[PDB]
């Protein structure tokens, strides 16, 4: 049976990167070509590529035995032991880390459940600062299943060492440059998004992420190369690969417009034909429909603008 | 019948996302000790697809807002933020088939919850800021497109007014019962989940909330009715109803043991056949697979 | 063009009846939930009734509640609304509208409806 894709606008959809949701959609040949990402990489036979997890609750986020010190000088100190988020066992294996962990860098601000054996909230949400890396003392190894986070402190919060889940609450110093995953090692990863033919460019779904900036006001893009609802949907269909490649057309439902034609590639990700050398931004509110099963050197029609 | 069967997902629960909470499905369970026909909102769809109360299709949407924030600090409370409410895709809020915007909370107590905020303070442009938000269960109106919040400050936290998204950080006083949706007026509701026949209990899909709590205690249960997964293949789908109930098997797929039939209703809600006193938790490795469609009064096996 | 196109209003004694009807054209209608809106002279619109795709889970305003039934036959891609009981605070432009996903983000041009006192 031909691969279909579900009936949802890109505005309605959740960020495979960062839990939010899908704000923009564009094409920049500014930007790097061949992006790492490792979240959001699905291929169309619904096969969960790098660390993509189903549940777009799992994004960025992370599940552990957490382990709770005072260190003078530095505060409270986590030592997180990684488990998957669903409590299955973290085993290292043919990917970078546990599904979901944060396939991006900079200092990250985390929120985990804490109990206290002091007075007042004796369950309170804390907040940690986890450098994502690559750092020369950042000693964070996600792929062995270890990562550390702190939060200054005078004294011990005296927190009881128990299961946790990580969200993200913020991001400091953002770079969308794949973290340190195992101490400096190499690591098992979903290749570089690509190849493109001469005039493809990816396209982009776009969020924005809560951030600490001391100077700079502006948003903090990240993008990916499918919403989740797309990981979601390869995953549970099974569609068969009759080519290399799909031809899709977004289209407005209510107008019958066809803004442009697309090749979404086996792997997983979107080319247009663009010639323009600055960002194409497109209307967030039409469809992706399946036109046909076409080989790689199909050769779409140039998107205008 | 010249109509394609409904089927679902093949995704086990423990690898979804709850529908009125952001978090991961941890439970699946019965527990006739609970109210057995809650008034829940969102995770609340029909079989044919069509989206109930606030039910958002992301699950990024579930239990946050949107907004354009106005900051001001009140003597007796603090930092005041007065939300002006917005869809949470950027569209106009407009009172109208339902209690709230798509994704607002469905339940009461007092919700922390993040936005960021610039603030005109030097060496500190941008940051979060948490606020406490009273949800109910009882002036917010957010039927109305208005909400506040407010943070205990000594004075004036210097935050610009702009656009926001706001997220659930933590809930204190949690109660699943429906917040003041309109300052005590009625609005239109999703009906409550049911109705159920004798020795029927709600399939309940659970997770766990960050909370604050002065007293310990254990970790604070939701529930929904479906998944979010669930939620948005029914919306892409658009199957034919042909009965009043589909009969599904939850099924171990590497084992091939069957652990318990139920029926899902049309209104998007699941029964099993329990009659036992205390609750009944289920493995969440399962799949439901659906066998066929079956009328109202179908009865079910035992569990 | 996806079309909504209402008729059946008009001029109504207080306590009397009519049937408003919205023909879809150029979508495929059993993907639409329904709705019909109205407004009166110096008010917002306002919602009136609300139907699932497969006519389902009817709701309706506290206002009209056991006074207004909607219904559809998506055979004739149409959706109904029996106005029964009327009054005069009935009195408006009646809008029909599709909801393909989240948003009613299609809508009918309208048809007056007077309720005489």
């Known amino acids: 049976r031909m691969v279909d894709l579900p009936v949802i606008q890109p505005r309605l959809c959740t960020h495979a990167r960062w839990p939010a949701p899908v704000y923009g959609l564009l094409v920049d040949p500014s930007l790097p070509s061949n992006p790492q990402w490792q979240n959001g990489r699905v291929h169309v036979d619904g096969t969960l590529l790098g660390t993509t997890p189903i549940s777009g609750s799992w994004v960025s986020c992370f599940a552990a035995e957490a382990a709770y010190k005072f260190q003078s000088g530095t505060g409270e100190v986590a030592t997180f032991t990684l488990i998957e988020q669903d409590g299955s066992a973290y085993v290292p294996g043919d990917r970078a880390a546990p599904l979901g962990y944060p396939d991006f860098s900079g200092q990250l601000e985390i929120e985990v459940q804490t109990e206290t054996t002091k007075t007042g909230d004796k369950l309170k949400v804390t907040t940690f600062e986890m450098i994502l890396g690559p750092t020369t003392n950042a000693d964070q190894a996600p792929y062995q299943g270890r990562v550390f986070a702190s939060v200054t402190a005078a004294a011990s919060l005296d927190l009881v060492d128990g299961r946790v889940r990580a969200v993200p609450r913020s991001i400091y110093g953002f770079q969308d440059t794949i973290p340190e995953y195992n101490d400096g090692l190499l690591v098992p990863l979903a290749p570089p998004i690509g190849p493109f033919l001469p005039g493809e460019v990816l396209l982009r779904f776009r969020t924005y992420m809560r951030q600490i900036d001391t100077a700079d006001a502006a948003a903090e893009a990240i993008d990916c190369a499918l919403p989740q609802e797309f990981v979601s949907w390869f995953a549970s269909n099974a569609f068969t690969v009759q080519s290399e490649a799909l031809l899709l057309r977004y289209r407005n439902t209510l107008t019958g417009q066809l803004l442009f034609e697309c090749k979404l590639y086996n792997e997983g990700y979107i080319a247009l034909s663009y010639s323009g050398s600055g960002p194409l931004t497109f209307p967030t509110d039409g469809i992706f429909e399946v036109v046909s099963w076409v080989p790689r050197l199909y050769q779409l029609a140039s998107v205008g603008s | 019948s010249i109509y394609r069967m409904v089927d679902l997902p093949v995704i086990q629960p423990r690898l979804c996302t709850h529908a009125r909470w952001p978090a991961p499905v941890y439970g699946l369970l019965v527990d006739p000790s609970l109210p057995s026909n809650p008034q829940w909102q969102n995770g609340r769809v029909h079989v044919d697809g069509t989206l109930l109360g606030t039910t958002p299709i992301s699950g990024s949407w579930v239990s946050c807002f949107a907004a354009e924030a106005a900051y001001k600090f009140q003597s007796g409370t603090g930092e005041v933020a007065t939300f002006t409410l917005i869809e949470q895709d950027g569209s106009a809020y407009v009172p109208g088939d339902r209690a709230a915007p798509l994704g607002y909370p469905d339940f009461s107590g007092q919700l922390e919850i993040e936005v960021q905020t610039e603030t005109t303070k030097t060496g500190d442009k941008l940051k979060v800021t948490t606020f406490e938000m009273i949800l109910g269960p009882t002036d917010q109106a957010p039927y109305q497109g208005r909400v506040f919040a407010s943070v205990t400050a000594a004075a004036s936290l210097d935050l610009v007014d702009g656009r926001v998204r706001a997220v659930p950080r933590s809930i204190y006083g949690f109660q699943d019962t429906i917040p003041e949706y309109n300052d005590g007026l009625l609005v239109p509701l999703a009906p409550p989940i049911g109705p159920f026949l004798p020795g029927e209990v709600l399939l309940r899909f659970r997770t766990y909330m960050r909370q604050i709590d002065t007293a310990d205690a254990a970790a604070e249960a939701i529930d929904c009715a479906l998944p979010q997964e669930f939620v948005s293949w029914f919306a892409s789908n658009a199957f034919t109803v042909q009965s009043e109930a589909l009969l599904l098997r939850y099924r171990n797929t590497l084992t091939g043991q069957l652990l318990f039939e139920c029926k899902l209703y049309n209104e998007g809600y699941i029964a099993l056949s329990y009659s036992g006193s205390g609750p009944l938790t289920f493995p969440t490795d399962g799949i439901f697979e659906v066998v066929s469609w079956v009328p109202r009064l179908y009865q079910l096996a035992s569990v | 063009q996806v079309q909504l196109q209402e008729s059946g209003g008009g001029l109504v004694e207080a306590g009397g009846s009519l049937r408003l009807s919205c023909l879809g054209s150029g979508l495929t209608f059993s993907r639409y939930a329904m709705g019909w809106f109205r407004q009166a002279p110096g008010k917002e619109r306002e919602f009136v009734a609300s139907?699932?795709?497969?006519?389902?889970?009817?709701n309706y305003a506290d206002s009209v509640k056991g006074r207004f039934t909607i219904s559809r036959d998506n055979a004739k891609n149409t959706v109904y609304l029996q106005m029964s009981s009327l009054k005069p605070e009935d009195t408006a432009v009646y809008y029909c509208?599709?909801?393909?996903?989240?948003?009613?983000?299609?809508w009918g041009q309208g048809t007056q409806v007077t309720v005489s006192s």
């Open positions: 509208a599709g909801r393909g996903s989240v948003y009613y983000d299609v």
């Open positions: 139907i699932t795709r497969s006519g389902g889970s009817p």
